[PDB]
């Protein structure tokens, strides 16, 4: 009943602040949606990311972007998981949540007390955000409550991975009495978590045996089925198993010598994943059979932060290395050379690349606690348009398969 503390005052003030901040970046946003690079219908063989919004907060500069994730419904949310990767500069972690509606001030925020080495939003409900931490504590945060604190934790009583939790995921549990989580850790291996009464309980999935359980630092699951996923290691190899111990390492795609840093499936042609390591080469390899060779190889000058197939097309993909250059390949215009290699940051080593499902932009993330958002010039995004007698998934299977057979019989 004092008007100057009424909640609806704060509501309309927040909307008026967005209404202000829009009118401070009008060009950056109008280009985000209504602009096509007019000088790439003239030179067919290359492209040019155009840099857009930049997102910094003053608690971030002492921190390093250590994950990024996008929300299923709205397509203006991020989830930056600021944290640490150096062995000697170990800090407390952070997690903002940003928006495209205001880029300057984050909508939400939290403040953990170890390095947030992953995030993931839930796909169906659209708010609950699972995270992990440098010290095994997987956490779950609920967002619309506006209480700067978790709603569940882990302990050493329920279950604790005991070393960094590099990646976590959300499983769809269909209208059941639960929600599901799959994880991965340096010591020991994959664990399943549930969301019970007021707790999160481990169930162990498999152990990554080779000295000790071999370390591992990433995994991805195939969308189109669920059980079969791809797991990195630090012994070097890449493994693939299913949600069982059903032939521990169903596939053992072994080709590497160091810590692999990224794997990725590609949403079209469900047999073909690429991967990427810290041996300065990323390899785009086929999986139904084919476990002893790589269809291709793309060497480069500094080790890979990460890789990502495009959401909109299974030829183009992009990769991010430890120099300042994001470089992005079309696998069907050039053949072993990057279509567009551009340096975006000045004095930081980039470390995280994430695409966007609907609008065509990309997020890349620094070493200095910042995230910067690039746009893809039209030569990078070329989806073969469907027609009357054919389906869109089929043409994009066909392009990749043609490139695969060409370089398969041309390699040897």
């Amino acid at each position: 009943v004092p008007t100057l503390q009424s909640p609806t005052l704060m509501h309309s003030l927040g909307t008026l602040d967005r209404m202000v901040n829009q009118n401070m970046y009008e060009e950056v946003a109008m280009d985000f949606k209504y602009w096509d690079d007019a000088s790439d219908a003239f030179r067919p063989g290359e492209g040019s990311l155009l840099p857009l919004w930049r997102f910094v907060s003053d608690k971030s500069k002492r921190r390093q972007v250590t994950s990024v994730c996008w929300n299923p419904l709205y397509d203006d949310m991020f989830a930056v998981g600021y944290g640490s990767y150096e062995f000697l500069k170990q800090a407390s972690g952070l997690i903002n949540i940003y928006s495209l509606k205001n880029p300057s001030h984050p909508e939400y925020t939290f403040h953990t007390e170890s390095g947030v080495m992953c995030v993931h939003f839930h796909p169906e409900f659209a708010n609950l955000l699972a995270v992990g931490c440098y010290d095994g504590s997987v956490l779950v945060y609920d967002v619309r409550l506006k209480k700067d604190e978790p709603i569940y934790q882990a302990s050493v009583r329920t279950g604790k991975l005991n070393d960094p939790v590099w990646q976590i995921y959300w499983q769809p549990d269909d209208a059941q009495k639960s929600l599901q989580f799959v994880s991965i850790s340096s010591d020991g291996a994959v664990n399943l978590w549930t969301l019970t009464k007021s707790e999160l309980i481990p169930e162990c999935l498999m152990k990554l045996r080779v000295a000790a359980g071999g370390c591992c630092m990433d995994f991805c699951k195939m969308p189109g089925q669920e059980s079969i996923y791809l797991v990195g290691t630090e012994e070097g190899a890449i493994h693939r198993c299913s949600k069982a111990y059903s032939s521990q390492y169903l596939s053992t795609y072994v080709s590497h010598h160091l810590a692999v840093y990224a794997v990725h499936w590609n949403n079209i042609h469900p047999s073909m994943f690429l991967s990427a390591s810290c041996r300065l080469d990323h390899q785009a390899v086929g999986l139904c059979h084919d476990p002893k060779r790589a269809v291709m190889n793309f060497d480069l000058n500094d080790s890979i932060g990460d890789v990502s197939w495009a959401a909109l097309q299974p030829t183009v993909f992009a990769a991010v290395t430890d120099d300042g250059r994001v470089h992005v390949f079309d696998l069907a215009q050039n053949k072993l050379l990057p279509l567009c290699s551009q340096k975006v940051v000045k004095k930081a080593k980039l470390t995280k690349l994430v695409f966007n499902p609907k609008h065509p932009i990309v997020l890349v993330g620094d070493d200095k606690g910042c995230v910067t958002s690039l746009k893809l010039s039209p030569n990078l995004r070329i989806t073969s348009k469907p027609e009357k007698g054919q389906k869109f998934e089929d043409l994009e299977v066909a392009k990749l398969d043609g490139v695969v057979e060409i370089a398969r019989k041309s390699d040897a």
Partner: protein, 94 residues
């Protein structure tokens, strides 16, 4: 401590020259100005425009209401968030 932090953020951007909150009839409470010879100008000129615009919108189909309003002059962007309790003003040249 959320209302005043949003006031302090919103008054420190690249173009903002003044934030005003005014009550139903008048009484501009919590201005932001180093003198008050033009706050009263805003407070007694603008909510006439806000409720006149609520008349214009609502007259058409009475399920409808008004929420915000912007007037962009040459050198100013007067944004008014009108509602039942009060009228709120933010002034900014882009």
């Amino acid at each position: 401590s959320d209302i005043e932090s949003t006031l302090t953020r919103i008054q420190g951007h690249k173009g903002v020259i003044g934030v005003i909150i005014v009550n139903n009839q008048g009484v501009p409470l919590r201005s932001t100005f180093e003198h008050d010879a033009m706050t009263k100008q805003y407070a007694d000129l603008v909510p006439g425009l806000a409720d006149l615009a609520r008349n214009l919108v609502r007259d058409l189909d009475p399920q409808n209401d008004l929420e915000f309003l912007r007037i962009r002059s040459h050198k100013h962007e007067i944004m008014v968030a009108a509602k039942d309790d009060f009228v709120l003003l933010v002034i900014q040249d882009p």
